[PDB]
Structure formats: C-alpha cells, structure tokens
Design a protein around this nucleic acid. Structure first.
Lengths: 115, 206, 53, 119, 122
RNA sequence: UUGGCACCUCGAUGUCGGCUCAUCGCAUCCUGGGGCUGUAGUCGGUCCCAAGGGUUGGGCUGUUCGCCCAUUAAAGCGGUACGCGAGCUGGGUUCAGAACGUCGUGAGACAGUUCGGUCCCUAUCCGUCGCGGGCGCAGGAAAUUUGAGAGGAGCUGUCCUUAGUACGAGAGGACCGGGAUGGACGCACCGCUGGUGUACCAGUUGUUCUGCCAAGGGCAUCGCUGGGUAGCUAUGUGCGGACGGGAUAAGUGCUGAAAGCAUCUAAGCAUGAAGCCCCCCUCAAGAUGAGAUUUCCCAUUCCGCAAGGAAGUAAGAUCCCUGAAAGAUGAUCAGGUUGAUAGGUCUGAGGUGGAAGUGUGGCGACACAUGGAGCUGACAGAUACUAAUCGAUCGAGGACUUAACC
C-alpha cells in the first residue's frame, strides 16, 4: 500500500533538489509573505537531521544568529522553498547531530570533505 | 443526503496550492454496490444497503449469494445500510463511486476504534493518579466508589474494562482529493480505526 | 475481606458448573487405528499425515 | 512481534542459540512447540547465511552459534557442518527448511511438546 | 511550553536580565504559552539601577522558545533558549533595543513595533 | 454552627485536614431570560424564572477558615458518618521518651508549647465496570435493521465590523446583528513534532572466552554512551459542543367580560430562556411485549394406536489448526491446500551509518578506496518452500384454535 502512497504522491515530490547529508552547510531560499509582497529569505546553516519517507521527508538546519542558536525544520518537497544550495559538505560520522545543540565556539565546526 | 463506504489504508501529507500541508487519511472505496432498497410500506423506513468487497465463494454462503443475486454481483463482506437519502435516484445492482464527492465537500465519517484491551481507569477515562511519593501507597487507581449513606455504589462510576472497539463518528471533516481511477479518497485529517478496517463516509449532517 | 456467610451447597454447585473438562479434539490413527489428537502424532503408530518418524 | 518465553533477553538469546546448535547437530529435537516456533525463523536465517557461504556470513554465524562438535571422527564443528553439509543440501530450496510436528503434552508441565526437523 | 515558575531571560535594554514567570494571561487556567503570548513576571536578576528592577512585577511577551513553534506549511522553528521582552501596559515595549532574533508569529499578534525594533525576524 | 437530651453502637461505628473519585440540593458565583431603579451610556443595585454546563494557580500556616500575589466570565453556599482511611497519606490532635514556662511538698499535671514516635486484612454476598457460556423468543440458519428505552455531550472569552454610530456637554461609549481567533473539556489518530522502543544500528571501557593477529561472543543496570522501525503514545495533529424546531417558566401582551369603565383571564388567541422533548453522538429485541425485512434449507428414516420419542442429515456452525487489526481467558476478526493466515525466501520502505577482507599512505595510533557500503524485530508487495493434514461433533422436519383468501 505504501506503493500506492508513492504512486499518488509522486506528483508533489520534487526533482530540483540536490542530495544533502546530515552535516553539511547549506543555504535555502525560502519564500515568505508579509503584505501580499512575497519575498525570499536565505537561511544558511548546517543540517542536523534528515528523516522520513518520500513526501513526509523532513530535515532540520541549525544556525547561530546574534549569539543565539536557532533551528528550523522543513519538509523537503515544499514549493515554498525556491531553492537550496550546498556551500560545503562535511566529514561526519553520524546522522543526527544533537550535540551541536549544546556546543558552540569553534568546537561546533565541521571538517569539510570536498566531495 | 449521500454516503459511501470503503476501507482505510493509512495517512500522509498533502499540499494545497501553497506550502500548506494537510494531514491526510487515505481510503480505498472500490465501487460499492446496492443490494436492497427498503421502503416504509414493508420495511417501515426508506433506506438502502451497500456492499463493499469481492469475497471468495469458499467464504460466502448460499443465502448471501441469493441476497446479492437479486443484483448481478458477487458476495460481499462489508455490507451496511444508509438512511435518509434520495431513493428514486438509486436502483439495485447500481454501483456508486467516489466521483459522488468533490474536493471541498464536508463529511461525517464513521468507523470502529482500535482495540486497546482491558485498560485501567486513567487510560480509559482520563482520571488523575495519586502521588508517586510522600509515602503514598496509592496510584493508578480509580478513586473512591462513593459515599456511605446509600450503602451501595451508584451507576456510571467509571472503572477498568475493555477500552476500544467502539463505533465512532467524526463530524465536519473535509475532503481533499479524489482518484476515481484508483477509487481513492483523501480526507483532511484522521479517522477512527485501524488499517484495513471499514469506514463509512457520509455527507455531513449539518 | 472474609466470607460474611458460609456458602451453601447449592451455590457451591452452581459455581462448579462450568468448572469442568471438555473432551479433546479426537481422531483415529488411520495407520494402526487407535485414537489421537487432531494435528498431532499417533504415539503408538508413531505416524502423522501418512508418514512415520 | 516475537515471544519472550518467560526469560530475559540475554538468557533467551542463549536458549535459542544453544537450541540452534543442537538442531544443526542432531537434525531433529524435541522441545516445546513455542520454542520451536521461535527457532524456525532464526534457524532458516542461519541457513541463508550458509547458502551465501561468504566469510562475512561465516563471521556472523560464528557470532551467533556456539563452539560445539557436530561430528566426531572428523573434528567437525556445528559451523562447518552448517555451511558445507546443509548448504549442499539446500542449494535449491527457498525457505521452509523446517518442519514442526506437534506432539501431545508433558506429564509434569502439561506442556505441549513438539519435535522439529530440517525439512 | 513555558509555564509558571519558568525562569527566562530578557532581550532588551530595559535593565532586566533574568525574569521569572507567574502566570499566562490567557483564560481561566492556561498551562502554557509558547510564542507571541503574554505573561506576568517578576525580575530576579537585573542590571544596576536602570529602568526595571529586582523583585518588580511586570508583564512581558514571549519572543522565543526551544519548545518551538509550528506553521501551517509544516515549517517548524525552535531556538536554543527561552526568552522574553517587557511591555508597557500595551503591546508596545519599553526597552529601546532588542538583543537576539525573533519569530514571525509576532505579526499575527500585533507586536510590529517589536518586529521593527528587532535586528532579525525568523 | 455552638449547643441541650442520652435513643442505637463500649463482645470496638477510626476521629481533623489533605489526595483520588464523584454525586445531590438551590437560598445561583458566571453564563441565559426578564421587572423595577435614586436605570443617560458603559458599569451597576435589587428582585423574579432558571441547577444545563462551568466555577483557577500559588505563598504562609498541620490546618479547616482566613490574609496576601497574580489571573479569571466567574473564582458560589451547603448535604452525602462536618462524603469517601477493608481507596491513599498521617502533618495535627491523642499512648509510652525528653525538655521549657507554670502549678504542686511530692509522685505528677496543663484545649500551654516544643522535638520524635509501627495505619493489618488473599473480597464470600450485594453493588459497580467489563467479558463469556446456557436457554428462551412455536421449524432450523446467515446477514442487515427498527426503535421503545438508556447513557453521553452539553462551558466561555478576546478581537474586527456595525460605529467611535445611539447616548453624552465631554470624558467616555452600546444594544441587537454579522464575522474571525482562542482558553478549558472531550473523542479519535500517529502523517508532522517529540517521547518510548531490553531479539535494530553504531561507538566505547574492564575482564574473560573462541589456539594466536584480525574479527567476534559472554558479564558488568539493555555495561555505558549516541541514535532509533513497528506498536503504544502527548505535550503533537484533526474534529466537536453549530445550525435549528415544538411545547413552556419568569416576563410581555392582543381581544374581552364578570364589575356599562379599566383589566394579560374566567372563555379564547400569541409570544417568550444556556432550561424540558427533539435535532447531534453511542448502546439497545432478555423490549419474555422477545419486533421487522431479504435470502438458504427441506419436510427424510425408525418406533409408537396416537401422544410423543431417537437417529442419521440438509442449509449452516463448531471442535482442531495458522494467526492478528482482536485479546487476561473465553470471545471477535482474517484464513485453513482452486490458499498468501503466519513464518521463511526475494524485492523494497524506513533506521543505522560507510561492514568484513583486500590494497594504498603512515614507524604507529589511524586515514582513504573498494562501496550510501554492510546490517536490520514486528513495516508492504510478491512467492505454495514449511506449518494450517486426515477427522470428528452439533444442527431442521416444523403444535392448536379462530378470521380472511382459497
């Protein structure tokens, strides 16, 4: 039956996307609406987490802004995201980087891999 | 008034001309068929039956076979009965499908809740527990049974028992999508019951 | 937490109605004849489903 | 789901492990039926590993099974027996490497015993 | 999912640094108030004697949590702390600046003043 | 309530407060509907009808009560052995110790104080909540159903508009009617968020074992740590309490006499509430008043004068077996060889995170490639490989009278 689910959700799935990994720095040009004036906003951070199947796939990006740690979770296949773009991959040994929640100050740094 | 009945499959997410998610429930309603068309002259009320299956003959029985053989169809497993609808519209042997509905009609849906088993007062009736410390030997228990004067226990005092398996309705849901080629409904939200289970859908009783 | 009264013979028996044993689900041993449990092995024939162990 | 068998995780693992070894050796054993039901899966699983015959599978199956003899006069152990003999037996079969014939109950337990075989 | 006896930190140049919660100004018994919500509070740690002071009762607005917020698109947002901002008997602040980022749910509620004061809104 | 009397109880009726559990009254705290007003409006006072629902969290005190802080639409008064200790606690009162003040010659004593001080019981009956079996319901069966009747639910704010209108000198600031969004409560569900997840994955310490290296196993709270599928879950998601009808309460009245007038009343007419009956949801034919509809089976054999009995069966169901969406057990449901019920196998999903071995670089720890690898419990799709074998049991023959068709 999950076959059936995939059959009916393949339309809302996307193909514009790169492959990204938990642990890699990444910008996203998400869309926003204020006064009927649509705009974009660039959320640039590191991927803590990616999970889910097909349309329910979800991923979390973490950042620091004005000394404050921020996390922002998105479902993958939104139309609301105009685009995503990697800036650097990362040599990481895990899938879910919940220790970076705690850490910062040049210990929360990811060794680039140049994939 | 309208109505249909099919089988639940599962849940997922769907967008709506936006980034706006929708938690969706998925139902397959292979084309249901009329079986009998009741009347106030003989049956005391106007109503119809609907069958939803295609059983094996090794599973069905003779009386079922006759009762359906009034129509030109096969024995059915999930047969139920709709009430208070237009009668002249329908006939016997008449199939009904999902293209009845559309992508914005509201609905009352009905099913059979999951079986949770012999559970206690808290999980069954939402009671509060006692403290887990400060010397208490009391928790997870239902409470007092009542006062002393009547020498008895009133009815309706709530207690453990087989939680689940109840016929439940959910009102004012909203249809999201239809796939008549796959005989599928996609409904905003969640319904009672487990997967593979019967679900009777109805035009909402506003 | 104790019996306020002694239980009478009648109610004792009425309780012990259902306290009883059903017979087994029994079948013959088609090999050497005698009886047997369904879906289980004939201890004396040492046979099952037309096959000896 | 899966059964517990009135034991903890560790000691049920040990039970099943010993029983797998015993069955590989003897090719037939009498136990309770439920224990057999729970064997059936893992036993056919180790047989898949034998059918693979890879070293990775050898090391997996070694991690599971116990270090016992399966045939004297050969210095053979259960693991070698498994791979060689049983994979050579069941090159061609796809699952269903077992039979579970129910026996009647036991005198002390009233426990429904049953034998289990490699077919 | 803050509640009473939560200790938060302030995000303005008012003179208060740490604060404690007494109540959510919702209904009869409201247990929690995630973001864009209002609370009654006391100061526990403050600066030297600026505007707001130790042991002073106020009411304040929440601007961020780590019990993050949800959005209709499924885009959720959580931060690494739980912070607030103080107001003046109205939806307007009193501190003249803001320290830290803020969410977009403060336009649903009409705290557009605070939104303008902010450096960033997310 | 303080009390008075001593009627049951001293062959034991456990006593304050608190927790859980609620329930009833209404002399109503809020919400609803009205009269009067020293009611301009907004807010109010008082009185009347209304008990459907709701009626906060903290500090101090053992406390009840009470004061205080901050909220709320409101923070109601009481009864139920000052409800509820075979349901909990046991802080206080109210045993034995010790101490202060005071009294007493003294032993000791104090509704004076202080510190500390064992709360037993496998539920027989009724009762309550759930679950099965038996029989009945003038033949035997499978399904769908009616609805007497029962239970549930039943709360409320804020904002916008009307309209800064009406009112007001101004400050200020509406009724009604529309619309949106919330709180608490409840139902369901896991697609999201998160949790758990002890036969999933990885890392890692000590020791020991597989002859040694490598690779692995055992024990150490699952050894610890980081994640985590299914399922179960809330804090998460969805949804609801809406539209409305009928008859009424207080109230308002119309017409109208008795009583040439007046009069809501006697005749006769109509309005009028969160309330009553319905509408909404659930259970429901043991509703012994046992219902209705559709479909299946046939009216066999032996005795027995008949009455009636047994003894093989039909339709059909079960024993037994595989199992779970179900489940304490029974039960329910899906299946039982012309079949995918479960396991296994193969594909996958998802989870973990880049296996072992080999090679290269490095003195080495180790890193890189082989290679999104390897592994994977329950998840879904196929697959007749294994096990659901062969059997056996039960199960109808359909009373009489009357009326109508015949």
């Amino acid at each position: 039956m999950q076959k059936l689910i995939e059959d009916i959700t393949k339309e809302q799935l996307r193909t514009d996307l790169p492959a990204f990994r938990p642990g890699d720095t990444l910008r996203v040009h998400v869309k926003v609406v204020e006064g009927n004036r649509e705009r974009i906003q660039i959320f640039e951070g590191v991927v803590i987490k990616r999970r889910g199947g097909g349309i329910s796939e979800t991923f979390t990006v973490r950042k620091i802004s004005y000394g404050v740690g921020v996390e922002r979770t998105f479902p993958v296949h939104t139309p609301k995201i105009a685009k995503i773009e990697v800036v650097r991959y990362g040599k990481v040994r895990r899938a879910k980087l919940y220790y970076l929640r705690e850490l910062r100050g040049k210990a929360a740094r990811i060794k680039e891999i140049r994939r | 008034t309208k109505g249909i009945l099919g089988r639940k499959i599962g849940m997922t997410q769907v967008f709506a001309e936006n980034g706006d998610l929708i938690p969706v429930t998925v139902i397959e309603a292979a084309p249901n068929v009329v079986l009998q068309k009741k009347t106030a002259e003989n049956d005391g009320y106007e109503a119809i039956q609907l069958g939803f299956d295609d059983k094996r003959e090794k599973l069905s029985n003779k009386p079922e076979k006759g009762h359906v053989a009034k129509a030109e169809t096969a024995p059915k497993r999930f047969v139920k009965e709709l009430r208070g609808v237009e009668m002249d519209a329908y006939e016997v042997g008449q199939e009904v499908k999902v293209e009845i509905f559309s992508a914005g009609e509201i609905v009352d849906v009905t099913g059979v809740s999951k079986g949770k088993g012999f559970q206690g007062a808290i999980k069954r009736h939402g009671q509060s527990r006692g403290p887990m410390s400060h010397g208490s030997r009391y928790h997870r228990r239902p409470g007092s049974m009542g006062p002393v004067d009547p020498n008895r226990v009133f009815k309706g005092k709530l207690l453990p028992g087989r939680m689940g398996g109840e016929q439940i309705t959910v009102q004012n849901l909203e249809i999201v999508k239809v796939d008549a080629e796959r005989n599928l409904l996609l409904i905003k939200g969640n319904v009672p019951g487990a997967k593979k289970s019967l679900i009777t859908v109805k035009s909402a009783v506003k | 937490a104790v019996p306020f009264r002694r239980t009478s013979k009648m109610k004792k028996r009425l309780r012990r109605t259902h306290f009883k044993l059903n017979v087994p689900g029994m079948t013959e041993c088609p090999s050497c004849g005698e009886m047997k449990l369904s879906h289980r092995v004939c201890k004396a024939c040492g046979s099952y489903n037309g096959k000896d162990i | 789901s899966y059964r517990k068998l009135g034991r903890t995780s560790a000691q049920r693992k040990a039970m099943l492990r010993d029983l797998t070894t015993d069955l590989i050796i003897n090719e037939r054993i009498e136990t309770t039926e439920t224990r057999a039901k729970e064997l059936r899966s893992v036993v056919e699983k180790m047989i898949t590993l034998g059918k693979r015959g890879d070293l990775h599978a050898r090391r997996q199956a070694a991690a599971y099974i116990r270090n016992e003899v399966a045939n004297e006069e050969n210095n053979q152990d259960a693991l070698q027996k498994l791979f060689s003999d049983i994979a050579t037996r069941y090159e061609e079969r796809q699952g269903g490497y077992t039979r579970i014939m129910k026996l009647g109950p036991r005198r002390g337990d009233g426990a429904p015993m049953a034998i289990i075989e490699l077919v | 999912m803050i509640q009473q006896e939560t200790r938060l930190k302030v995000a303005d140049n008012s003179g208060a640094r740490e604060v404690l919660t007494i109540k959510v100004l919702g209904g009869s018994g409201r247990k929690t108030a995630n973001i864009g919500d209002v609370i009654v509070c006391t100061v526990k740690q403050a600066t030297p004697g600026g505007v707001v002071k130790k042991g002073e009762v106020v009411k304040a607005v929440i601007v961020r949590t780590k019990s993050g917020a949800r959005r209709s698109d499924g885009s959720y947002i959580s931060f690494d702390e739980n912070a607030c901002v103080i107001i003046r008997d109205d939806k307007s602040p009193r501190g003249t600046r803001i320290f830290g980022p803020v969410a977009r749910e403060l336009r649903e509620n009409n705290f557009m003043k605070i939104v303008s004061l902010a450096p960033e809104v997310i």
